């Protein structure tokens, strides 16, 4: 009955891609042009029903939408996991080097 | 090493994986388990090995 929800989440797309609804902000450093400007807007405007909903963030520039489109393939969405988003952990998850 | 040797010889004589491993005596397999290694104990961990991991 008892499940570690973080381990479980590693078996979903969360474990394969940047989950726009859960993944810590540092992950956006993996690809050109996402950090810190887009990273901030994405985390601030989460959750999303689908990856393509990220294109609808209010105030995005035309260039930002293009960059987002180029990176949709690296993104996913799964259900919000309380354990990953509480504590401001998406902005600092206690991991440094 | 001896377990793997016996399994390979079984596989080479046309056994299935199930058959090859089923042919390994339990007694040989039990030697290949760290709970039977004498360098895994404690000075004040008293009594039979069975008192730790259990009766196999």
């Amino acid at each position: 009955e008892l499940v570690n929800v973080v381990d479980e989440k590693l078996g979903t797309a969360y474990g394969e891609k940047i989950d726009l609804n859960n993944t810590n902000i540092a992950a956006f450093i993996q690809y050109r042009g996402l950090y810190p400007t887009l990273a901030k807007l994405i985390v601030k405007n989460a959750p999303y029903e689908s990856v393509e909903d990220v294109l609808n963030i209010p105030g995005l520039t035309e260039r930002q939408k293009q960059i987002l489109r180029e990176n949709l393939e690296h993104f996913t969405v799964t259900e919000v996991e309380t354990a990953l988003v509480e504590g401001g952990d998406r902005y600092n998850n206690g991991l440094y080097k | 090493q001896e377990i793997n040797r016996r399994v390979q010889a079984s596989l080479a004589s046309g056994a299935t994986l199930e058959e090859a491993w089923s042919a390994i005596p339990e007694k040989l397999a039990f030697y290949d388990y760290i709970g039977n290694n004498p360098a895994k104990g404690g000075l004040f961990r008293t009594g039979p090995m069975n008192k730790g991991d259990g009766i196999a």
Binding site: L2, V3, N4, D7, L84, G87, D89 | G54
Partner: protein, 243 residues
């Protein structure tokens, strides 16, 4: 008005601003304007814990406790929009602030009860037809209570949710079933309820004060044991301003 050096070390930093007895006025609400709470402060004075009922299934009461974590308990610098609704009611939507404190209280006999005293994501509303906020106004609302420890927290044996071992490594050949509840950390998220009773209003400044009562669960140690029910009583202060 006091400076940091006036306040430092006195215990005043953990108290909410108060209003004088003359402040029994009314603060006009204009349904055309936007409003905000610039500062909400909540200062607990009493923590009560519901006794775990013997087994009579009779009335289990909330009992007094002793605070052991000192003057570290208040919620403050909380802000958010104050909506005016169709029916003339007000809805405060908490957006940010110092909106949680870990608190440990001690029951008679020694049992320590940690809790995350909080109003995170508070949405609280008045009665309908609040043309002016008076000493008859009150707010009732719900808030979120996340796990007292967050996902990185490691127990004394190094086990955790987002980090740590996933077994009892000191008992290498123990049967794992009876240790599952200790080995598998779970993150709690529940709801709390709060009432704010306005007792004082400065009609000129838009400052209000009064008493609060809140109810929420205590720490469950990442799913290792059952939380306790806690009732928190205290005073509050809020400054309302046109947004």
């Amino acid at each position: 008005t006091l400076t940091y050096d006036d306040i430092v070390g006195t215990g005043l930093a953990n108290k909410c601003p108060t209003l004088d007895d003359t402040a029994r006025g009314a603060y006009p609400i204009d349904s055309s304007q936007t409003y905000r709470i610039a500062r909400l402060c909540l200062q607990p004075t009493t923590f009560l814990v519901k006794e775990e009922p013997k087994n009579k299934r009779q009335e289990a009461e909330f009992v007094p406790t002793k605070l052991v974590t000192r003057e570290t308990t208040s919620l403050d610098q909380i802000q958010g929009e104050l909506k005016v609704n169709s029916d003339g009611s007000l809805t405060f939507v908490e957006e940010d602030g110092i909106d949680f404190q870990p608190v440990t209280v001690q029951m008679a006999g020694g049992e320590r009860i940690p809790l995350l005293f909080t109003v995170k994501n508070l949405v609280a509303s008045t009665q309908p037809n609040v043309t002016s906020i008076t000493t008859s106004t009150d707010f009732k609302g719900e808030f979120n209570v996340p796990s007292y420890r967050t996902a990185n927290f490691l127990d004394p044996k190094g086990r955790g949710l987002a980090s740590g071992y996933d077994s009892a490594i000191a008992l290498p050949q123990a049967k794992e079933e009876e240790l599952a509840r200790a080995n598998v950390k779970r993150f709690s998220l529940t709801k709390g309820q709060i009432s704010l009773n306005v007792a004082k209003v400065d009609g000129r400044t838009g400052e209000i004060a009064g008493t609060f009562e809140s109810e929420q669960l205590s720490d469950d140690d990442m799913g290792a044991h059952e939380p306790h029910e806690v009732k928190i009583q205290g005073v509050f202060y809020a400054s309302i301003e046109p947004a």
